[PDB]
Design a protein around this ligand. Structure first.
Ligand SMILES: Nc1ccn([C@H]2C[C@H](O)[C@@H](COP(=O)(O)OP(=O)(O)OP(=O)(O)O)O2)c(=O)n1
Ligand SMILES: [Ca+2]
Ligand SMILES: [Ca+2]
Ligand SMILES: [Ca+2]
Ligand SMILES: [Ca+2]
Ligand SMILES: [Ca+2]
Ligand SMILES: [Ca+2]
Ligand SMILES: [Ca+2]
Length: 903
DNA sequence: TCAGGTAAGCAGTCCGCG
DNA sequence: GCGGACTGCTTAC
């Protein structure tokens, strides 16, 4: 097999590499790697190396890496550019793996672990590590086993061994419901003392040294705790055995308002799943506890226990251990679904970076581009210092707030990457500038044609047309990959709707789910068999279809993220290729493209309808347009349609056969106007929206920019079995809005769009009546909590104190003195509730850590003093009033002449 | 929240607005 | 009470 790296590190003048050899075995080597860097040289000097601008360079080969880094400093002292890859391990990987890496994940050791620490005096700080580690569960991907290290004897209590038999039994049998599928995979190791537990864990670690290290909060808690605890008990040299190269470093991670410490384990790639989830899931969660996320992702129940976690080991050691094992399993389950480890491996090996560098698109792109240029013996420029400067972004059209009955949307495929490719935007393709007219002049095609030679953006920039820049070349490769995975994603989605349709008529039979590849549209034969299947088999097929869709979504959306981040990186000072001329060339072209096609669509539809100066385009944001289709529907007449799906087919056919050709023509003209390299502005129909045929639903509405709702029947070619609400920006979409309120607002919107004013009034009346019964957590607001210190003045709010921070200060006074009370953590999220006047908390609100029940120290008083009225007005009534005013509807029945006529 | 970008919405504070 | 200047936070793209 072809060899591939596992990890790479620079330690002094040595590269330390863990790798898989040609025989599939894990090996480690120390290499005295001699790096090369580059200086510009005279034309008269014969060379094969040239910088990205075509200037000749001489290669300097150094005796060691220290010499190379020292040369860089001397070149800065002289004031001369020192060219080449200054991250020597990236250069090493480029030299060592000079081909497309094909990796075998089965040879990569992926370790998933979690630890338990009993602590009576509050949260056990990793930096202190003053409490014993009393449980470790460590899953190994190669062995496919959960290794359980269980401390039976502690200063905080001596316990009996964990029982696998009881662990397996149902909660109803007194058991812990450890999943049957993992019971046989548990290797249980009890220990009479902590010293032996940790010594065995390190011996284990040495035998089965993780390559990829993951878990939940491992980088911020588990790793530093284990390292510091071993350090405290045994000394530094023993703790450094967690590194295969015996090297560690305390790394200080700085944010805006403080800093934290992590332990860098050289020769290991830590991918904390919380951090993978935050980057790659495209969610914003009210809480990032494993319990909350596992519930969200897997629909598994909350792991319940009696009393505080600080007494769980002593009171119920059996459950304590079972829950530690289950915690490790839940992270594996989330990954089976989301596949973020797979993604990280794919992207890391593609770029030829340390796997953990996938968190940094700048590092990722720097290596992709470096490897690409190296192939041509081209030499990358030195990174330079830049002051942070603001620059303009996208255009957003101000909508007229209103109801909108029939709507069709259109959207540009991968806009910013498509602009990069069309215009040929790259560091080395800059040809010059032209004299810019106001953007409105380009939009309306009155401005002089910018160039007859070069490819242009309305920001004034001109680019070469003779060859693709390295940025367009490399962005195109990842774009193509993204497009492939999106195809699989959409097929799985369409296949899912086929199954949902069939679930209307399930057959009374005992059968099996079909063995199919959900990434491909179901054949007629598969469709015929599906119509004969039971609900059990169909539901099993639906779950698998939905899993396939998720897998495709991860692969596609994060590749989309990676390519969009290249456009963004051009506007980040730490990028080697930072250039606001290029960054602004992209964004300014985008603004033109949107407003250009707005005009073309308006012109086309005015012609088709035989009118003049009427606005068909009602809204647009960045690269999308929303077109009012009322007149189109009216031109055939609503009474001519057999059902909803009939007018949806008509609009679909109209969008594809009439509008898209007009849009294409409009963009081809714009391409020629800017003299671009290649026409790549592809704007396809996205949504077809409207009320159900024969209903009083309003179809859709806008309240303002980035705030709208649509009742959608078809999205990017997926025809839904049931109409889907597309809601953007409204409170239903905000993590800060209470859970029950999001749900209630969504139902109000559903009623508005699908059923009408009366149905909405019926629901509002009921919600207002019953909402005081809702669980306090489901009606609590959520907020991130930053700068708690800044606004704390003797436990009381300082000037300008934010509402949620006030809540926290209130909480802090109420729990004053309690070491065991849950503390609000700076930078994390809190639930927030308003409090009625004259409450014993001495203020108008209280806030506690999100995803948790408020401590029983104060739970009864909060419940008793919760301000339900304020809560309802602020989170529910005010947003609804916004929705209904925009839609020109009333959420409460107005008085009419008909009342009353009853005798 | 260490880790690509800008536009823009709403909550809330402070305080003016005769 | 509304809105303007501002901070805070959270979305859409
Ligand atoms: N996180 C994001 C999302 C959007 N954008 C910019 C770049 C995109 O090209 C443009 C349009 O965003 P879309 O959400 O429509 O995504 P794309 O057009 O890039 O891809 P596609 O529409 O094919 O899914 O906005 C961005 O810079 N960063
Ligand atoms: Ca735990
Ligand atoms: Ca397993
Ligand atoms: Ca799209
Ligand atoms: Ca798009
Ligand atoms: Ca059937
Ligand atoms: Ca879009
Ligand atoms: Ca203070």
């Amino acid at each position: 097999m072809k060899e591939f790296y596992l990890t790479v590190e620079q330690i002094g003048d040595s590269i330390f590499e863990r790798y898989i050899d040609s025989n599939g075995r894990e090996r480690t080597r120390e290499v005295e790697y001699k790096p090369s860097l580059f200086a510009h040289c005279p034309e008269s000097q014969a060379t094969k190396y040239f910088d990205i601008y075509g200037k000749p360079c001489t290669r300097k080969l150094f005796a060691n890496m220290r010499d190379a880094s020292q040369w860089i400093k001397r070149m800065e002292d002289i004031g001369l550019e020192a060219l080449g890859m200054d991250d020597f391990k990236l250069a090493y990987l480029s030299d060592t793996y000079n081909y497309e890496i094909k990796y075998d994940h089965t040879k990569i050791r992926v370790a998933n672990f979690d630890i338990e620490v009993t602590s009576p005096d509050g949260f056990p700080e990793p930096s202190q590590a003053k409490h014993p580690i009393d449980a470790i569960t460590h899953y190994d991907s190669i062995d496919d086993r959960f290794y359980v290290f269980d401390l039976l004897n502690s200063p905080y209590g001596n316990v009996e061994e964990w029982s696998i038999e009881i662990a397996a039994k149902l909660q109803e049998q007194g058991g812990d419901e450890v999943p049957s599928e993992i019971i046989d995979k548990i290797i249980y190791m009890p220990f009479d003392n902590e010293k032996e537990l940790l010594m065995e864990y390190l011996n284990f670690w040495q035998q089965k040294t993780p390559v990829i290290l993951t878990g939940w909060n491992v980088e911020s808690f588990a790793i530093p705790y284990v390292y510091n605890r071993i350090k405290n008990i045994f000394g530094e040299s023993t703790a450094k055995r967690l590194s295969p190269h015996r090297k560690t470093r305390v790394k200080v991670i700085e944010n805006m308002y403080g800093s934290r410490e992590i332990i860098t384990l050289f020769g290991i790639s830590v991918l904390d799943y919380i951090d993978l989830y935050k980057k790659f899931s495209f969610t914003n969660q009210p809480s990032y506890s494993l319990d909350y996320i596992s519930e969200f992702e897997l629909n598994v129940g909350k792991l319940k226990y009696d009393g505080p976690i600080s007494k769980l080991r002593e009171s119920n050691h059996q459950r304590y251990i079972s829950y530690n094992i289950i915690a490790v399993y839940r992270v594996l389950q989330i990954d089976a679904k989301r596949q973020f480890i797979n993604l990280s491996l794919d992207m890391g090996y593609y770029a030829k970076i340390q796997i953990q560098s996938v968190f940094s698109p700048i590092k990722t792109w720097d290596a992709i581009i470096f490897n690409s240029l190296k192939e041509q013996n081209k030499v990358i420029p030195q990174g330079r210092s830049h002051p942070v400067q603001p620059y303009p972004g996208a255009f957003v059209k101000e909508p007229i707030p209103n109801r909108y009955k029939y709507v069709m949307s259109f959207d540009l495929t991968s806009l910013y990457p498509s602009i990069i490719r069309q215009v040929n935007i790259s560091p080395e393709t800059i040809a010059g500038t032209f004299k810019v007219a106001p953007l409105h002049d380009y939009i309306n095609a009155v401005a002089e044609r910018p160039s007859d030679v070069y490819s242009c953006s309305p920001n004034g920039m001109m680019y070469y047309k003779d060859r693709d820049g390295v940025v367009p070349t490399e962005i195109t490769k990842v774009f193509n990959q993204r497009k492939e995975h999106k195809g699989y994603m959409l097929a799985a989605q369409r296949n899912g709707e086929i199954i949902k349709e069939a679930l209307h008529n399930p057959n009374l039979s005992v059968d099996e789910p079909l063995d199919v590849d959900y990434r491909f549209d179901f054949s007629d034969e598969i469709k015929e068999k599906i119509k004969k299947l039971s609900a059990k088999s169909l539901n099993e097929m639906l779950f698998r279809a939905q899993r396939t869709e998720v897998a495709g979504m991860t692969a596609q959306i994060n590749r989309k993220l990676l390519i969009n981040s290249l456009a963004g990186a051009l506007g980040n000072v730490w990028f080697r290729y930072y250039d606001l001329r290029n960054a602004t060339a992209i964004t300014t072209f985008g603004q033109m493209a949107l407003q250009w096609i707005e005009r073309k669509v308006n012109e086309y539809l005015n012609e088709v309808c035989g009118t003049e100066g009427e606005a068909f385009v009602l809204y647009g944001d960045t690269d999308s347009i929303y077109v009012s289709a009322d007149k189109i529907i009216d031109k055939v007449g609503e009474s001519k349609f057999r059902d909803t799906n009939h007018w949806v087919d008509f609009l679909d056919k109209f969008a594809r056969e009439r509008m898209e050709p007009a849009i294409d023509r409009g963009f081809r003209e714009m391409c020629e106007y800017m003299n671009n390299k290649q026409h790549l502005m592809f704007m396809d129909r996205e949504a077809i929206a409207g009320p159900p045929l024969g209903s009083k639903g309003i179809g859709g509405f806008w309240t303002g920019k980035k705030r709208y709702a649509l009742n959608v029947w078809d999205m990017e070619g997926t025809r839904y079995a049931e109409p889907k609400l597309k809601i953007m920006g409204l409170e239903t979409q905000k993590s800060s809005t209470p859970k029950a309120v999001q749900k209630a607002l969504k139902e109000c919107i559903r009623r508005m769009l699908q059923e009408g004013e009366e149905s909405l009034q019926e629901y509002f009346k009921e919600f207002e009546k019953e909402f005081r019964q809702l669980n306090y957590i489901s009606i609590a607001s959520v907020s991130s909590a930053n700068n708690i210190a800044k606004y704390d003045v003797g436990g009381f709010p300082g000037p300008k104190c934010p509402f949620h921070i006030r809540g926290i200060l209130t909480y802090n006074r109420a729990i004053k003195g309690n070491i065991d009370a849950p503390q609000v953590v700076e930078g994390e999220k809190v639930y927030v509730l308003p409090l009625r006047e004259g409450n014993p908390f001495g203020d108008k609100c209280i806030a506690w850590p999100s995803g948790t029940e408020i401590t029983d120290l104060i739970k009864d008083d909060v419940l008793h003093w919760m301000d339900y009225t304020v809560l309802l007005e602020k989170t529910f009534i005010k947003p609804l009033e916004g929705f209904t005013s925009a839609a020109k509807l009333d959420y409460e029945k107005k008085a009419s002449l008909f009342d009353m006529f009853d005798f």
